[PDB]
Design an enzyme around this catalytic site. Structure first.
Site, PDB file in Angstrom:
ATOM      1  N   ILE A   1       0.823  -1.199   0.000  1.00 17.35           N
ATOM      2  CA  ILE A   1       0.000   0.000   0.000  1.00 17.35           C
ATOM      3  C   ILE A   1       0.871   1.270   0.000  1.00 17.35           C
ATOM      4  O   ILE A   1       1.994   1.281   0.593  1.00 17.35           O
ATOM      5  CB  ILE A   1      -1.002  -0.008   1.187  1.00 17.35           C
ATOM      6  CG1 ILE A   1      -1.923   1.232   1.144  1.00 17.35           C
ATOM      7  CG2 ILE A   1      -0.277  -0.165   2.526  1.00 17.35           C
ATOM      8  CD1 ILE A   1      -3.275   1.044   1.805  1.00 17.35           C
ATOM      9  N   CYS A   2       0.341   2.317  -0.639  1.00 15.31           N
ATOM     10  CA  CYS A   2       0.863   3.677  -0.583  1.00 15.31           C
ATOM     11  C   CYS A   2       2.139   3.769  -1.383  1.00 15.31           C
ATOM     12  O   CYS A   2       2.100   3.515  -2.555  1.00 15.31           O
ATOM     13  CB  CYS A   2       0.906   4.109   0.885  1.00 15.31           C
ATOM     14  SG  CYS A   2       1.603   5.602   1.198  1.00 15.31           S
TER      15      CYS A   2
END
Lengths: 184, 184
Positions: A102-103
Protein backbone atom coordinates in the site's frame (compact mmCIF):
# COMPACT_ATOMS: atom_id res chain seq x y z
CA UNK A 1 -5.50 -21.32 8.86
CA UNK A 2 -4.10 -18.40 6.89
CA UNK A 3 -0.69 -16.94 7.81
CA UNK A 4 0.33 -13.35 6.91
CA UNK A 5 3.54 -11.41 7.40
CA UNK A 6 3.36 -7.66 7.89
CA UNK A 7 6.85 -6.11 7.90
CA UNK A 8 7.33 -2.88 9.84
CA UNK A 9 10.06 -0.30 9.85
CA UNK A 10 10.84 3.01 11.40
CA UNK A 11 8.71 5.54 9.50
CA UNK A 12 6.16 3.01 8.38
CA UNK A 13 2.64 4.55 8.02
CA UNK A 14 0.93 3.53 11.26
CA UNK A 15 -2.70 3.71 10.15
CA UNK A 16 -1.77 1.44 7.27
CA UNK A 17 0.25 -1.07 9.27
CA UNK A 18 -2.31 -1.42 12.12
CA UNK A 19 -5.29 -1.41 9.74
CA UNK A 20 -3.76 -4.37 7.91
CA UNK A 21 -2.91 -6.20 11.13
CA UNK A 22 -6.13 -5.64 13.02
CA UNK A 23 -8.37 -6.33 10.06
CA UNK A 24 -6.68 -9.64 9.14
CA UNK A 25 -6.55 -10.88 12.72
CA UNK A 26 -10.31 -10.21 12.91
CA UNK A 27 -10.65 -12.61 10.05
CA UNK A 28 -8.79 -15.27 12.10
CA UNK A 29 -5.42 -14.98 10.33
CA UNK A 30 -2.22 -15.52 12.16
CA UNK A 31 -0.43 -12.27 11.49
CA UNK A 32 3.29 -11.91 12.26
CA UNK A 33 4.31 -8.28 12.68
CA UNK A 34 8.02 -8.39 11.90
CA UNK A 35 10.41 -5.51 12.41
CA UNK A 36 13.01 -4.89 9.71
CA UNK A 37 14.99 -2.82 12.22
CA UNK A 38 17.54 -3.89 14.75
CA UNK A 39 14.93 -3.48 17.52
CA UNK A 40 11.48 -5.07 17.84
CA UNK A 41 10.10 -1.59 18.62
CA UNK A 42 9.66 0.63 15.59
CA UNK A 43 8.87 4.34 15.62
CA UNK A 44 6.35 4.87 12.88
CA UNK A 45 5.99 7.97 10.66
CA UNK A 46 3.80 9.95 13.04
CA UNK A 47 5.63 8.74 16.14
CA UNK A 48 3.37 5.79 17.10
CA UNK A 49 5.72 3.17 18.68
CA UNK A 50 4.86 -0.40 17.91
CA UNK A 51 6.49 -3.40 19.37
CA UNK A 52 6.72 -6.01 16.61
CA UNK A 53 6.06 -9.69 17.34
CA UNK A 54 9.44 -10.64 15.79
CA UNK A 55 12.53 -9.39 14.02
CA UNK A 56 12.41 -10.27 10.34
CA UNK A 57 15.70 -12.15 10.57
CA UNK A 58 13.94 -14.56 13.01
CA UNK A 59 11.34 -15.60 10.41
CA UNK A 60 13.35 -15.38 7.22
CA UNK A 61 12.93 -19.09 6.51
CA UNK A 62 9.22 -19.18 7.39
CA UNK A 63 6.43 -19.42 4.83
CA UNK A 64 3.32 -17.21 4.67
CA UNK A 65 0.23 -17.28 2.51
CA UNK A 66 0.59 -13.49 2.11
CA UNK A 67 3.14 -10.76 2.71
CA UNK A 68 1.42 -7.40 3.11
CA UNK A 69 3.62 -4.27 3.08
CA UNK A 70 2.60 -0.99 4.80
CA UNK A 71 3.54 2.39 3.23
CA UNK A 72 5.08 5.48 4.81
CA UNK A 73 8.25 7.27 3.77
CA UNK A 74 11.07 6.75 4.50
CA UNK A 75 9.45 3.54 5.85
CA UNK A 76 8.94 1.98 2.45
CA UNK A 77 12.58 2.66 1.63
CA UNK A 78 13.72 0.87 4.83
CA UNK A 79 11.55 -2.11 3.82
CA UNK A 80 13.00 -1.91 0.30
CA UNK A 81 16.54 -1.91 1.71
CA UNK A 82 15.95 -4.89 4.03
CA UNK A 83 17.86 -7.83 2.56
CA UNK A 84 15.89 -10.36 4.56
CA UNK A 85 12.45 -9.00 3.48
CA UNK A 86 13.71 -8.78 -0.14
CA UNK A 87 14.70 -12.44 -0.11
CA UNK A 88 11.38 -13.42 1.47
CA UNK A 89 9.46 -11.42 -1.12
CA UNK A 90 11.29 -12.95 -4.05
CA UNK A 91 10.80 -16.48 -2.78
CA UNK A 92 7.13 -16.00 -1.90
CA UNK A 93 6.53 -14.46 -5.37
CA UNK A 94 8.04 -17.48 -7.16
CA UNK A 95 6.09 -19.81 -4.83
CA UNK A 96 2.74 -18.31 -5.91
CA UNK A 97 1.92 -16.63 -2.55
CA UNK A 98 -0.05 -13.34 -2.35
CA UNK A 99 2.14 -10.22 -2.35
CA UNK A 100 0.56 -6.96 -1.27
CA UNK A 101 1.52 -3.35 -0.72
CA UNK A 102 0.00 0.00 0.00
CA UNK A 103 0.86 3.68 -0.58
CA UNK A 104 4.55 4.15 -1.48
CA UNK A 105 5.53 0.44 -1.16
CA UNK A 106 4.12 -0.79 -4.47
CA UNK A 107 6.69 1.49 -6.19
CA UNK A 108 9.49 1.72 -3.64
CA UNK A 109 9.46 -1.96 -2.76
CA UNK A 110 7.56 -4.07 -5.28
CA UNK A 111 8.65 -2.36 -8.49
CA UNK A 112 12.26 -1.66 -7.34
CA UNK A 113 12.67 -5.44 -6.82
CA UNK A 114 11.00 -6.33 -10.13
CA UNK A 115 8.01 -8.03 -8.47
CA UNK A 116 5.32 -6.54 -10.67
CA UNK A 117 6.34 -7.98 -14.06
CA UNK A 118 3.33 -8.48 -16.26
CA UNK A 119 1.02 -7.03 -13.61
CA UNK A 120 -0.89 -3.77 -12.88
CA UNK A 121 -0.57 -1.81 -9.70
CA UNK A 122 -1.51 1.36 -7.97
CA UNK A 123 0.14 3.43 -5.27
CA UNK A 124 -0.02 6.75 -3.55
CA UNK A 125 -0.74 8.97 -6.58
CA UNK A 126 2.62 10.79 -6.55
CA UNK A 127 4.32 7.45 -7.04
CA UNK A 128 2.31 6.40 -10.05
CA UNK A 129 5.07 7.51 -12.50
CA UNK A 130 7.50 5.11 -10.86
CA UNK A 131 5.55 2.54 -12.90
CA UNK A 132 5.85 2.09 -16.68
CA UNK A 133 2.61 3.26 -18.33
CA UNK A 134 1.35 -0.28 -19.08
CA UNK A 135 1.69 -1.38 -15.45
CA UNK A 136 -0.41 1.53 -14.08
CA UNK A 137 -3.61 0.00 -12.78
CA UNK A 138 -6.77 1.61 -11.42
CA UNK A 139 -8.71 1.88 -8.20
CA UNK A 140 -8.09 2.62 -4.59
CA UNK A 141 -7.45 -1.15 -4.47
CA UNK A 142 -6.05 -2.99 -7.51
CA UNK A 143 -5.98 -6.76 -7.84
CA UNK A 144 -3.54 -8.14 -10.46
CA UNK A 145 -3.27 -11.93 -10.33
CA UNK A 146 -1.32 -12.56 -7.10
CA UNK A 147 -0.54 -8.88 -6.55
CA UNK A 148 -2.77 -6.64 -4.49
CA UNK A 149 -2.01 -2.94 -4.24
CA UNK A 150 -3.63 0.11 -2.70
CA UNK A 151 -3.29 3.86 -2.41
CA UNK A 152 -3.15 5.34 1.08
CA UNK A 153 -4.18 5.59 4.67
CA UNK A 154 -7.94 5.94 4.11
CA UNK A 155 -7.86 2.96 1.75
CA UNK A 156 -6.04 0.66 4.23
CA UNK A 157 -9.28 -0.97 5.48
CA UNK A 158 -10.58 -1.50 1.88
CA UNK A 159 -7.15 -2.94 1.08
CA UNK A 160 -7.18 -5.40 4.02
CA UNK A 161 -10.78 -6.45 3.29
CA UNK A 162 -9.81 -7.32 -0.26
CA UNK A 163 -6.97 -9.38 1.17
CA UNK A 164 -9.54 -11.22 3.32
CA UNK A 165 -11.70 -11.81 0.27
CA UNK A 166 -8.79 -13.18 -1.74
CA UNK A 167 -7.26 -15.32 1.06
CA UNK A 168 -10.65 -16.48 2.45
CA UNK A 169 -13.74 -15.53 0.47
CA UNK A 170 -16.10 -12.64 -0.05
CA UNK A 171 -18.41 -13.86 2.70
CA UNK A 172 -15.57 -13.72 5.30
CA UNK A 173 -14.63 -10.20 4.10
CA UNK A 174 -18.25 -9.05 4.38
CA UNK A 175 -18.35 -10.24 8.01
CA UNK A 176 -15.22 -8.27 8.88
CA UNK A 177 -16.54 -5.25 6.94
CA UNK A 178 -19.60 -5.37 9.20
CA UNK A 179 -17.49 -5.56 12.35
CA UNK A 180 -15.57 -2.37 11.26
CA UNK A 181 -18.80 -0.73 9.96
CA UNK A 182 -17.42 -0.37 6.51
CA UNK A 183 -20.06 0.13 3.77
CA UNK A 184 -18.99 -2.90 1.59
CA UNK B 1 -0.49 25.08 19.06
CA UNK B 2 -3.13 22.50 19.96
CA UNK B 3 -2.56 19.77 22.57
CA UNK B 4 -4.46 16.44 22.67
CA UNK B 5 -4.49 13.51 25.04
CA UNK B 6 -5.31 10.05 23.75
CA UNK B 7 -5.55 7.50 26.56
CA UNK B 8 -4.76 3.89 25.73
CA UNK B 9 -5.41 0.66 27.54
CA UNK B 10 -5.00 -3.03 27.08
CA UNK B 11 -7.72 -4.03 24.63
CA UNK B 12 -8.11 -0.60 23.14
CA UNK B 13 -9.15 -0.73 19.43
CA UNK B 14 -5.84 -0.26 17.45
CA UNK B 15 -7.18 1.18 14.27
CA UNK B 16 -9.16 3.75 16.26
CA UNK B 17 -6.34 4.79 18.60
CA UNK B 18 -3.75 5.11 15.81
CA UNK B 19 -6.13 6.77 13.40
CA UNK B 20 -6.76 9.45 16.00
CA UNK B 21 -3.06 9.88 16.86
CA UNK B 22 -1.64 9.91 13.37
CA UNK B 23 -4.33 12.10 11.90
CA UNK B 24 -4.02 14.74 14.61
CA UNK B 25 -0.24 14.82 14.51
CA UNK B 26 -0.46 15.36 10.76
CA UNK B 27 -2.47 18.51 11.57
CA UNK B 28 0.46 19.69 13.81
CA UNK B 29 -1.14 18.84 17.17
CA UNK B 30 0.98 17.74 20.02
CA UNK B 31 -0.56 14.41 20.90
CA UNK B 32 0.21 12.64 24.18
CA UNK B 33 -0.50 8.92 24.03
CA UNK B 34 -0.96 8.01 27.67
CA UNK B 35 -1.23 4.47 28.98
CA UNK B 36 -3.82 3.85 31.72
CA UNK B 37 -2.01 0.62 32.54
CA UNK B 38 0.98 0.07 34.78
CA UNK B 39 3.23 -0.28 31.73
CA UNK B 40 3.81 2.14 28.89
CA UNK B 41 3.29 -0.75 26.47
CA UNK B 42 -0.35 -1.68 25.95
CA UNK B 43 -1.57 -4.79 24.17
CA UNK B 44 -4.46 -3.67 22.06
CA UNK B 45 -7.56 -5.69 21.16
CA UNK B 46 -6.10 -7.50 18.17
CA UNK B 47 -2.67 -7.91 19.75
CA UNK B 48 -0.95 -4.80 18.35
CA UNK B 49 1.52 -3.64 21.07
CA UNK B 50 1.82 0.11 21.34
CA UNK B 51 4.27 1.88 23.50
CA UNK B 52 2.61 4.92 24.91
CA UNK B 53 4.47 8.20 25.28
CA UNK B 54 3.54 8.43 28.96
CA UNK B 55 1.71 6.78 31.80
CA UNK B 56 -1.50 8.69 32.56
CA UNK B 57 -0.27 9.23 36.14
CA UNK B 58 2.53 11.36 34.73
CA UNK B 59 0.18 13.86 33.06
CA UNK B 60 -2.77 13.95 35.47
CA UNK B 61 -2.26 17.60 36.28
CA UNK B 62 -1.73 18.64 32.66
CA UNK B 63 -4.18 20.54 30.49
CA UNK B 64 -5.24 19.56 26.94
CA UNK B 65 -7.43 21.27 24.36
CA UNK B 66 -8.96 17.87 23.68
CA UNK B 67 -9.16 14.43 25.21
CA UNK B 68 -9.96 11.83 22.56
CA UNK B 69 -10.89 8.29 23.68
CA UNK B 70 -10.40 5.19 21.50
CA UNK B 71 -12.94 2.32 21.68
CA UNK B 72 -12.34 -1.42 21.98
CA UNK B 73 -13.71 -3.75 24.60
CA UNK B 74 -12.70 -4.42 27.29
CA UNK B 75 -10.46 -1.44 26.50
CA UNK B 76 -13.18 1.13 27.01
CA UNK B 77 -13.91 -0.39 30.40
CA UNK B 78 -10.25 -0.12 31.47
CA UNK B 79 -10.35 3.56 30.44
CA UNK B 80 -13.67 3.93 32.33
CA UNK B 81 -12.12 2.37 35.44
CA UNK B 82 -8.98 4.52 35.37
CA UNK B 83 -9.34 6.98 38.30
CA UNK B 84 -6.73 9.33 36.85
CA UNK B 85 -8.40 9.57 33.40
CA UNK B 86 -11.81 10.03 35.10
CA UNK B 87 -10.54 12.95 37.11
CA UNK B 88 -8.95 14.47 33.97
CA UNK B 89 -12.16 14.07 32.02
CA UNK B 90 -14.31 15.71 34.64
CA UNK B 91 -11.96 18.67 35.02
CA UNK B 92 -11.57 19.17 31.25
CA UNK B 93 -15.34 18.95 30.80
CA UNK B 94 -15.97 21.73 33.38
CA UNK B 95 -13.15 23.80 31.81
CA UNK B 96 -14.88 23.84 28.43
CA UNK B 97 -12.34 21.61 26.63
CA UNK B 98 -13.30 19.24 23.80
CA UNK B 99 -14.18 15.70 24.93
CA UNK B 100 -14.27 12.99 22.28
CA UNK B 101 -14.87 9.26 22.04
CA UNK B 102 -15.40 6.55 19.51
CA UNK B 103 -17.12 3.14 19.36
CA UNK B 104 -17.88 1.78 22.85
CA UNK B 105 -16.33 4.69 24.78
CA UNK B 106 -19.19 7.21 24.30
CA UNK B 107 -21.36 4.82 26.38
CA UNK B 108 -18.84 2.98 28.55
CA UNK B 109 -16.78 6.03 29.48
CA UNK B 110 -18.61 9.27 28.69
CA UNK B 111 -22.13 8.31 29.74
CA UNK B 112 -21.02 6.17 32.72
CA UNK B 113 -19.28 9.30 34.14
CA UNK B 114 -22.18 11.63 33.40
CA UNK B 115 -20.27 13.62 30.76
CA UNK B 116 -23.04 13.76 28.14
CA UNK B 117 -25.70 15.69 30.10
CA UNK B 118 -27.77 17.81 27.78
CA UNK B 119 -25.88 16.49 24.73
CA UNK B 120 -26.38 14.04 21.82
CA UNK B 121 -24.01 11.23 21.02
CA UNK B 122 -23.48 8.18 18.91
CA UNK B 123 -21.50 4.95 19.48
CA UNK B 124 -20.97 1.53 18.08
CA UNK B 125 -24.59 0.67 17.21
CA UNK B 126 -24.93 -2.12 19.81
CA UNK B 127 -24.23 0.46 22.51
CA UNK B 128 -26.87 2.96 21.37
CA UNK B 129 -29.38 1.78 24.03
CA UNK B 130 -26.93 2.64 26.78
CA UNK B 131 -28.13 6.20 25.96
CA UNK B 132 -31.55 7.56 26.92
CA UNK B 133 -33.65 8.09 23.77
CA UNK B 134 -33.23 11.91 23.80
CA UNK B 135 -29.44 11.61 23.99
CA UNK B 136 -29.20 9.46 20.86
CA UNK B 137 -27.65 11.53 18.13
CA UNK B 138 -27.08 11.02 14.45
CA UNK B 139 -24.26 10.34 12.06
CA UNK B 140 -21.13 8.26 11.87
CA UNK B 141 -19.66 11.33 13.58
CA UNK B 142 -21.84 13.44 15.93
CA UNK B 143 -20.93 16.90 17.17
CA UNK B 144 -22.83 18.13 20.25
CA UNK B 145 -21.44 21.39 21.62
CA UNK B 146 -18.11 20.32 23.15
CA UNK B 147 -18.72 16.61 22.68
CA UNK B 148 -17.64 14.70 19.59
CA UNK B 149 -18.61 11.09 19.17
CA UNK B 150 -18.28 8.43 16.48
CA UNK B 151 -19.24 4.86 15.61
CA UNK B 152 -16.35 2.50 14.80
CA UNK B 153 -13.10 1.56 13.19
CA UNK B 154 -14.01 2.63 9.63
CA UNK B 155 -15.20 5.96 10.97
CA UNK B 156 -12.00 6.72 12.96
CA UNK B 157 -10.44 8.89 10.20
CA UNK B 158 -13.74 10.80 9.67
CA UNK B 159 -13.85 11.19 13.44
CA UNK B 160 -10.28 12.61 13.73
CA UNK B 161 -10.80 14.93 10.74
CA UNK B 162 -13.85 16.44 12.49
CA UNK B 163 -11.63 16.91 15.51
CA UNK B 164 -9.17 18.81 13.29
CA UNK B 165 -11.97 20.90 11.87
CA UNK B 166 -13.28 21.89 15.28
CA UNK B 167 -9.85 22.39 17.00
CA UNK B 168 -8.30 24.16 13.90
CA UNK B 169 -10.67 24.87 11.02
CA UNK B 170 -12.22 23.21 8.05
CA UNK B 171 -9.43 24.23 5.72
CA UNK B 172 -6.86 22.46 7.94
CA UNK B 173 -9.03 19.31 8.06
CA UNK B 174 -9.28 19.26 4.22
CA UNK B 175 -5.50 19.41 3.92
CA UNK B 176 -5.21 16.39 6.19
CA UNK B 177 -8.03 14.66 4.37
CA UNK B 178 -6.03 15.06 1.12
CA UNK B 179 -2.89 13.63 2.77
CA UNK B 180 -4.84 10.46 3.82
CA UNK B 181 -6.73 10.40 0.47
CA UNK B 182 -10.06 10.72 2.17
CA UNK B 183 -12.63 12.04 -0.30
CA UNK B 184 -13.88 14.88 2.06
Amino acid sequence: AVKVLVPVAHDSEEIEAVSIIDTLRRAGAEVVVASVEDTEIVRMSRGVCVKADKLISAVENETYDCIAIPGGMPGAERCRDSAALTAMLKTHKAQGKLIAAICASPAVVLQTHGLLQGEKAVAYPCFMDQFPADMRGEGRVCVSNKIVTSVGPSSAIEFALKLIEVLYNKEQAKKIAAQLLYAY
